[PDB]
Amino acid sequence: MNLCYIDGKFLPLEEAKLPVTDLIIQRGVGVFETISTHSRRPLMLTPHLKRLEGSATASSIVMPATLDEMARIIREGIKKMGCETMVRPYITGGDSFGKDHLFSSSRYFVIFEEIRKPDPILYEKGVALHPINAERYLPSTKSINYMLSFTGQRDSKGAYEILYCPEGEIVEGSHSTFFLIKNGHLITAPTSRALSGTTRQIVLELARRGNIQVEERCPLLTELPEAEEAFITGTVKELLPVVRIGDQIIGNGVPGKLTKHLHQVYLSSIVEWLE
């Protein structure tokens, strides 16, 4: 059964509640991370928790607990779940922004859910993305503000996910890092424009090991017709092939050989980063 750690107790997820005074509710002041398990071990736990601290600090939120304590809560909740888990620690703004311009009464909670991997068919067929002329502001901060990721699916024609394409420059997915494959090179946006993905970080290491050239630049919507493949990355989704962006088919519209090869190396290699 799904759990939420809040106020020192693991609760059934559906019972845990947050006071409406909290500025996460009133004004969207919050940061979080998504951490997944393989063989019940958290992947990239320390990178995730360092990114959580980075997000909080960037947002003038004083940490309401140490990373060691969050690591403690996360391992214990995984053990309590007894299954592969997706774990989201949340840090809230809390009730006030002080005269010192800090949130010094932050609340925290951690959600534990049984992991929901995309359907095997999606890895076989690949997915479609809906491009929109928008961008994440302060992109290295993972805030709770995902509202664009949903509201944009009104005219998204059943797309799996939105793709942020400000001024025709591809930056990242609403929930993912985006990679294009052109003449057997990886192209992906620099961390000035996109979240510093944990999955993104592993894929660049796998590219270094495999002698695959990476260009850290925004791929362009106008380069898509010359691309062979595309995929998106995230801790739960792993590497998910992209076969269509808007009305533009990628390559011959099925997952490509380099995507499938990187996904196999990913699954073989990730033991190195289990904690």
Ligand X SMILES: Cc1ncc(COP(=O)(O)O)c(C/N=C(\CON)C(=O)O)c1O
- The annotation places the binding site for pyridoxal 5'-phosphate at 51, 146, 198-199, 235
Contact 232, 178 (CB under 8 A): yes
Q: How many residues does the chain have?
A: 275
Check binding of 37 to ligand X (CB under 6 A). no
Q: 214-216 and 229-234 as β-strands: parallel, antiparallel, unpaired?
A: unpaired
Q: Whole-angstrom Cα distance, residue 64 to residue 132?
A: 36
For the CB of residue 147, give the shortest distance to ligand LCS in the complex, in Å. 13
For the CB of residue 23, give the shortest distance to a second copy in the complex, in Å. 8
Among 59, 85, 106, 235, binds ligand X (CB under 6 A): 235
Q: How far is CA 118 from CA 121, 194, 230, in A?
A: 8, 22, 17
- Which does residue 144 bind out of a second copy, ligand LCS, ligand X, none, counting CB within 5 to 8 angstroms by kind? a second copy
Q: Whole-angstrom Cα distance, residue 73 to residue 85?
A: 13
Check binding of 140 to a second copy (CB under 8 A). no
Angle at the Cα of 244 from the Cα atoms of 241 and 248, rounded to 5 degrees: 145
Contact 243, 125 (CB under 8 A): yes
Among 130, 193, 237, 244, binds ligand X (CB under 6 A): 237
Nearer to ligand X, 175 or 260 (CB): 175
Angle at the Cα of 269 from the Cα atoms of 265 and 271, rounded to 5 degrees: 150
How many binding residues for ligand X (CB under 6 A)?
15
Q: Which residues pair with 103 in a beta bridge?
A: 61
Q: Which of residues 156-185 bind ligand X (CB under 6 A)?
A: 172, 175-177
Interaction site with ligand LCS (CB under 6 A)? 34, 172, 174-177, 195, 197-200, 233-237
Q: Quick check: helix, strand or coil at residue 139? A: coil
Contact 48, 202 (CB under 8 A): no
Q: Which of residues 36-95 bind a second copy (CB under 8 A)?
A: 58-60, 88, 90, 93
| Closest CA relative to residue 230, chosen from 203, 194, 269, 270 | 203
Interface segment toward ligand X; rule CB under 6 A; list 62-70, 74-82, 191-199, 260-268:
191-199
Check binding of 262 to ligand X (CB under 6 A). no
- Which does residue 59 bind out of a second copy, ligand X, ligand LCS, none, counting CB within 5 to 8 angstroms by kind? a second copy
Check binding of 115 to ligand X (CB under 6 A). no
Check binding of 199 to ligand X (CB under 6 A). yes
For the CB of residue 212, give the shortest distance to ligand LCS in the complex, in Å. 18
